[PDB]
Amino acid sequence: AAARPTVSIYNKDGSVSSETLALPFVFKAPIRPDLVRSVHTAVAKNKRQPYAVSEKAGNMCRSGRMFAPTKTWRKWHVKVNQNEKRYAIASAVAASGVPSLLLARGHRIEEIPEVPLVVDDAVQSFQKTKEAVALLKEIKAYRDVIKVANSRKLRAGKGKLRNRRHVQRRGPLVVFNEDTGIVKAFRNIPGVEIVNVRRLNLLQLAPGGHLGRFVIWTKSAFGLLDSVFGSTTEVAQLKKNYFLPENIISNADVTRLINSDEIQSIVKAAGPSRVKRAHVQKKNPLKNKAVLSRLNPYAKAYKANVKINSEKTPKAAGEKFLSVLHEN
């Protein structure tokens, strides 16, 4: 798997810096939309509260006991193996470096200088939310925040009667390494969520079950990525005995696998992509004279009628045959 060795760190002023970081091994791990879905599906039922009816209180009678009283001992929280959770989150981190899966999730990053977007450690020492907006607008990531602000509708239905009043999209994600004022800088900015490197959450890297959240790493956080996830050969220093997943294939681009020389030199001939319709209609050889020539390369010369008479016809009849014919 060969891709983009180095990433470029952007200063506060927005200008690129000469320093660079090797792309972490996690950023090549398999990207699995089904596995992230069936893990986010579960992990999202884990902050649920139980509801039920009064046990004291048939189903069809007014003021009656509805069929199957809701019971609090229902299954609220769902178990997922850890190695399934780390895979779904290593995949979730890998898919945040692919710009296509970020646009396709609705992120307005058409002017972001580079993905994965990394800044220097000076963003962790911010204090004022004027500063974060100052930085965001020089990295041209403020389109996301201006998108989320305009997307603040009122919920549809009986949800808003239930402390669930408003809705809006998800903005950029800022992954830091040390708290010195970054968490209280960016937090009031609509949508912008700040989460530590060591406790990355699938509900924040794969919201809705969908891969590709726009993440804004910092330099100290990005450098720790080689230690929190590990590599497919070494092991994460922080996660014990954990190796990144190994994929079914190396070159995930199939059209290169197929359209390569080493295969296209040995495949047999190529048929047409669409085969023309042969014998669209049935034309009668008798009724149509042209189809007869197609089937009968003899009909050109038949002369069916032949004169086999007028040559002194030898009347043939046995006399005794006539005698037995004209009897009784």
Binding site: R4, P99, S100, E110, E111, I112, P113, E114, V115, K140
Partner: protein, 100 residues
């Protein structure tokens, strides 16, 4: 792709080797008003690209020009305005009339 930007059709192009930098991803060129010269521009810029890809750009350039043409002719003609209808003023005037 071919998409217009303020009365001028531009040809937008992207490459695999600029796919990781969203700001500089889409190189853009300007396609001339002369339709015949526009098509020579596409081929000499989209050359050795698949014939399918150059095929779809020419169609869009064709289909965008017809848009720009139609936008021009409609402006020339003194087409009628479309003043909308309000459900509150319609009702209030309906009731105030009946009383009158």
């Amino acid at each position: 792709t071919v998409r217009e930007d303020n009365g001028k059709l531009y040809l937008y192009m992207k490459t695999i080797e600029r796919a990781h930098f969203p700001s500089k991803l889409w190189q853009r060129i300007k396609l001339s008003k002369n339709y015949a010269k526009a098509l020579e521009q596409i081929d000499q810029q989209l050359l050795y690209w698949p014939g399918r890809q150059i095929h779809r750009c020419k169609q869009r350039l064709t289909r965008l020009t017809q848009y720009l043409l139609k936008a021009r002719r409609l402006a020339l003609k003194h087409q009628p305005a479309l003043i909308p209808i309000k459900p509150k003023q319609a009702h209030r005037e309906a009731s105030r009339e009946r009383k009158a």
